[PDB]
Amino acid sequence: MSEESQAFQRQLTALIGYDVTDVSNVHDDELEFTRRGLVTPRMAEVASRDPKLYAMHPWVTSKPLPEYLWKKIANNCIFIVIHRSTTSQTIKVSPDDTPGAILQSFFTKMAEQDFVLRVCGRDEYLVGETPIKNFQWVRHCLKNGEEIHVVLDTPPDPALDEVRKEECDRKFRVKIRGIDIPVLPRNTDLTVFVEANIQHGQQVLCQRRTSPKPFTEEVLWNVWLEFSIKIKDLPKGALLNLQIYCLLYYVNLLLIDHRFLLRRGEYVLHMWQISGFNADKLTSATNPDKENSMSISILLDNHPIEMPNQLRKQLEAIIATDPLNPLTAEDKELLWHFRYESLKHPKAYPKLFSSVKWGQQEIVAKTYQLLARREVWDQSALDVGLTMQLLDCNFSDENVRAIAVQKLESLEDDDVLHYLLQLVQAVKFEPYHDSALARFLLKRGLRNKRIGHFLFWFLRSEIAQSRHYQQRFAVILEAYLRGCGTAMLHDFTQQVQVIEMLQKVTLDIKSLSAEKYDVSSQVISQLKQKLENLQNSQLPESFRVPYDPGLKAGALAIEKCKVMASKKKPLWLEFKCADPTALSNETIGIIFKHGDDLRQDMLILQILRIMESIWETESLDLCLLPYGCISTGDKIGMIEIVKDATTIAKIQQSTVGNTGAFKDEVLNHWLKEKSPTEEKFQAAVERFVYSCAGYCVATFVLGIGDRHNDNIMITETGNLFHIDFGHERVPFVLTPDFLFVMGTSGKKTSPHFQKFQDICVKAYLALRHHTNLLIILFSMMLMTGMPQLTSKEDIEYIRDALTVGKNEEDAKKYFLDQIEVCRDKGWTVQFNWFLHLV
Numbered sequence: 001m002s003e004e005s006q007a008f009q010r011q012l013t014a015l016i017g018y019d020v021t022d023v024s025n026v027h028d029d030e031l032e033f034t035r036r037g038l039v040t041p042r043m044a045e046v047a048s049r050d051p052k053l054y055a056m057h058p059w060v061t062s063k064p065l066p067e068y069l070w071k072k073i074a075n076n077c078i079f080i081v082i083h084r085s086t087t088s089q090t091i092k093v094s095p096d097d098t099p100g101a102i103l104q105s106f107f108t109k110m111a112e113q114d115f116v117l118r119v120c121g122r123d124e125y126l127v128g129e130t131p132i133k134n135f136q137w138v139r140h141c142l143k144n145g146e147e148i149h150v151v152l153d154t155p156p157d158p159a160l161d162e163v164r165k166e167e168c169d170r171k172f173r174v175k176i177r178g179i180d181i182p183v184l185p186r187n188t189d190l191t192v193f194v195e196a197n198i199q200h201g202q203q204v205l206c207q208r209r210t211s212p213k214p215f216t217e218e219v220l221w222n223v224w225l226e227f228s229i230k231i232k233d234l235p236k237g238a239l240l241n242l243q244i245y246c247l248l249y250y251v252n253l254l255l256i257d258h259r260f261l262l263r264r265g266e267y268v269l270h271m272w273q274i275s276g277f278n279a280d281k282l283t284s285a286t287n288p289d290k291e292n293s294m295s296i297s298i299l300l301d302n303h304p305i306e307m308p309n310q311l312r313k314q315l316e317a318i319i320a321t322d323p324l325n326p327l328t329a330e331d332k333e334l335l336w337h338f339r340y341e342s343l344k345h346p347k348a349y350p351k352l353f354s355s356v357k358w359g360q361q362e363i364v365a366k367t368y369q370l371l372a373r374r375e376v377w378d379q380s381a382l383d384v385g386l387t388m389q390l391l392d393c394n395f396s397d398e399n400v401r402a403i404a405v406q407k408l409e410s411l412e413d414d415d416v417l418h419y420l421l422q423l424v425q426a427v428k429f430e431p432y433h434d435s436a437l438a439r440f441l442l443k444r445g446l447r448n449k450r451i452g453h454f455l456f457w458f459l460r461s462e463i464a465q466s467r468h469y470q471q472r473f474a475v476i477l478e479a480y481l482r483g484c485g486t487a488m489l490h491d492f493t494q495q496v497q498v499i500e501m502l503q504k505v506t507l508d509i510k511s512l513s514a515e516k517y518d519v520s521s522q523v524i525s526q527l528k529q530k531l532e533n534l535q536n537s538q539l540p541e542s543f544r545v546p547y548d549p550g551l552k553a554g555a556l557a558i559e560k561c562k563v564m565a566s567k568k569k570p571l572w573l574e575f576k577c578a579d580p581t582a583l584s585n586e587t588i589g590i591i592f593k594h595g596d597d598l599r600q601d602m603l604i605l606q607i608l609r610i611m612e613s614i615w616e617t618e619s620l621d622l623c624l625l626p627y628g629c630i631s632t633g634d635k636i637g638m639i640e641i642v643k644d645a646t647t648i649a650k651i652q653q654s655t656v657g658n659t660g661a662f663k664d665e666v667l668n669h670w671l672k673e674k675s676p677t678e679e680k681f682q683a684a685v686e687r688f689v690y691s692c693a694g695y696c697v698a699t700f701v702l703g704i705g706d707r708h709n710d711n712i713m714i715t716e717t718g719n720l721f722h723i724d725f726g727h728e729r730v731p732f733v734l735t736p737d738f739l740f741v742m743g744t745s746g747k748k749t750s751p752h753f754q755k756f757q758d759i760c761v762k763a764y765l766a767l768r769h770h771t772n773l774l775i776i777l778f779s780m781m782l783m784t785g786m787p788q789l790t791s792k793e794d795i796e797y798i799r800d801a802l803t804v805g806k807n808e809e810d811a812k813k814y815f816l817d818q819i820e821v822c823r824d825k826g827w828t829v830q831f832n833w834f835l836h837l838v
């Protein structure tokens with residue numbers, strides 16, 4: 001192994017944020033085994049991909065152009081403006097024309113083909129045999145009444161993507177020797193015992209406890225715990241979960257390893273402490289802090305492997321229930337007995353597999369037999385909600401999860417991007433490091449630069465702040481980095497250097513000030529100085545914007561930089577675009593913040609993006625504005641600065657605003673004053689109506705509707721939008737001023753208001769057609785992103801919000817009433833936010 005390669009592993013370690021060659025925290029070889037196992041999948045995808053399309057990563061879709069976008073094209077023509085150094089002729093185009101085709105209606109239309117079309121000021125290319133209406137940039141330009149500006153240039157050299165070459169029927173039992181913790185001191189000396197559970201898909205097959213003993217820094221039971229389950233009956237993927245009750249600490253050990261061998265021998269496991277139901281409780285990793293943590297020693301000495309009319313009605317009823325409906329023992333017995341009928345309803349699959357007795361070898365075998373004749377499933381139309389249901393904490397069986405991944409195989413790149421964060425979060429529910437899901441993400445990321453970019457940041461986000469999963473995600477990220485190509489690698493290196501520098505600055509400045517005071521010139525002077533120093537050497541000529549990889553940021557515009565006045569003291573940075581072909585002088589705004597887990601915001605924003613695509617599948621545009629947000633490290637990251645935007649509170653505050661008085665007409669005035677004409681003003685009011693509806697609906701369903709005015713913004717162009725998603729009542733925010741813009745006051749009516757209620761209802765029922773998708777996303781969001789959330793009651797909110805079980809009439813009713821409540825409450829809740837502080 002050349003000294004060069006060691007230097008390389010060193011480089012990867014600095015991009016990843018973890019050393020995957022570190023063996024300090026392992027009790028076996030699963031991780032190393034996996035690093036090797038992933039070599040094959042990587043090399044296969046790298047060698048399979050087309051160098052040209054890979055270099056230009058065109059962003060395309062197979063979905064049809066929505067109705068609301070055809071409206072802007074009634075002439076069946078689209079104008080593309082090509083530029084190549086001075087003047088620029090604007091080619092008339094047909095929504096069906098191909099990039100190579102408009103190149104024909106050009107050269108000859110003018111009068112050597114080794115050239116390509118690139119969006120101006122972006123690393124974005126319109127290539128491949130795809131209709132121009134199928135390009136995301138084209139649809140983005142239409143939805144925004146913007147012109148499509150392109151530049152003629154030379155295709156990127158695929159050479160630049162070169163990848164470096166690589167080179168017994170007995171019952172199961174376990175002995176609990178004892179537990180050891182360096183220092184126990186809490187308050188009153190209590191007693192302690194160990195609870196050992198055998199689980200599979202978060203289902204306890206068998207449970208045993210030790211006798212209670214006095215809780216001292218070392219407790220020695222030396223006791224055998226014999227379980228009712230036979231060794232032969234242990235399903236692969238089953239965990240021996242060990243817990244300390246006083247619940248203080250937990251830890252897990254996979255009973256059967258990555259080689260199909262029964263675990264055996266002595267183990268001293270460092271446990272995780274509960275912070276006084278969630279994915280962290282399922283980890284096979286042990287606490288990396290060996291110095292201050294509880295440990296438990298154990299010994300293992302135990303290689304393997306026609307329906308009557310009315311009953312059919314019961315079965316179908318069971319199948320129609322929602323993902324969260326509990327399955328009764330009767331239900332499970334039915335689903336199982338009628339196994340073969342059940343297998344004819346893809347939607348029954350999750351309910352059916354939750355009906356399997358996983359602690360019985362014979363039954364599991366019958367199950368694989370069931371999966372053998374999978375014809376109905378394989379030919380079923382892809383249902384993302386259904387596929388995700390089989391990837392959650394409820395299924396630990398490799399094969400069951402594999403058919404889910406099989407269905408994902410059929411997703412187009414545009415959809416993978418929509419679900420990526422949730423798939424990645426779903427890797428936490430995998431019992432082994434090497435899994436079909438992990439390999440699928442690897443594969444899709446290496447196949448496409450955009451998915452790879454995001455995959456990188458999403459993995460890095462978790463590696464930096466999750467002790468429970470950093471090891472696994474690190475192995476996966478490394479596998480990806482070893483295949484993305486030198487170009488991407490150089491880019492990631494730049495992005496990481498930049499954010500690392502800015503992290504230093506952010507922290508230092510937060511120190512030079514109190515917690516809550518204000519922002520003085522001492523602190524601002526210090527900022528501009530520190531930045532001035534970086535601009536010289538430290539901060540690279542350019543770098544890709546992490547939440548918008550097609551955008552290249554150049555030098556900082558130091559005169560415009562500053563520290564924002566908020567509890568936390570985040571930086572307000574602005575950069576020049578490093579692309580001369582850019583169509584404007586507008587800088588690139590980025591907010592840098594330390595002290596908050598931006599992962600929750602990423603999660604919400606991403607679900608918001610999903611809600612948009614769902615509404616798109618229905619021909620609806622609610623004008624949401626899910627700005628870029630990326631967790632880059634522990635409690636720190638970057639956020640996109642939406643241009644020409646203010647807080648609804650700030651609009652209020654600039655006018656008197658003593659103690660938080662509130663006037664209904666302020667908003668309308670602000671909008672009228674920022675509009676150059678009445679035309680632009682009407683457009684602003686309309687957009688406000690649409691965006692208000694979208695955020696009201698989205699926010700009610702996700703159960704985040706009750707927000708303070710300071711957490712909601714609006715663009716000068718009328719787009720309302722929510723922010724700061726980090727962790728008496730009202731369902732959402734629709735205050736009298738919003739109402740005022742709608743032409744109503746004092747519980748009255750109006751054309752825009754009526755239009756609003758219509759949009760809300762259309763939006764709401766449009767989501768109910770996706771009820772399962774939303775429910776499964778909501779619960780995965782809770783399990784992998786929040787603290788220890790009740791696997792029932794917290795999650796049940798969404799079932800109620802989507803009013804599952806009701807017909808259309810009762811739903812509309814429920815929401816309209818919801819709209820009335822905000823009205824009756826007026827300014828009440830908003831007003832309350834100020835007093836709680838006094």
Ligand SMILES: CC(=O)Nc1ccc2c(c1)OCCc1cc(C(=O)N(C)c3ccccc3Cl)sc1-2
Pocket residue numbers: 564566570591593627639640641642643645646647723724725
């Ligand atoms: C002129 C103008 O005020 N521009 C401006 C200010 C703030 C934002 C913005 C534009 O757009 C990007 C969307 C956004 C999201 C934010 C957020 O999540 N949090 C949590 C937050 C809240 C307050 C302060 C800082 C932050 Cl990061 S802040 C913010």
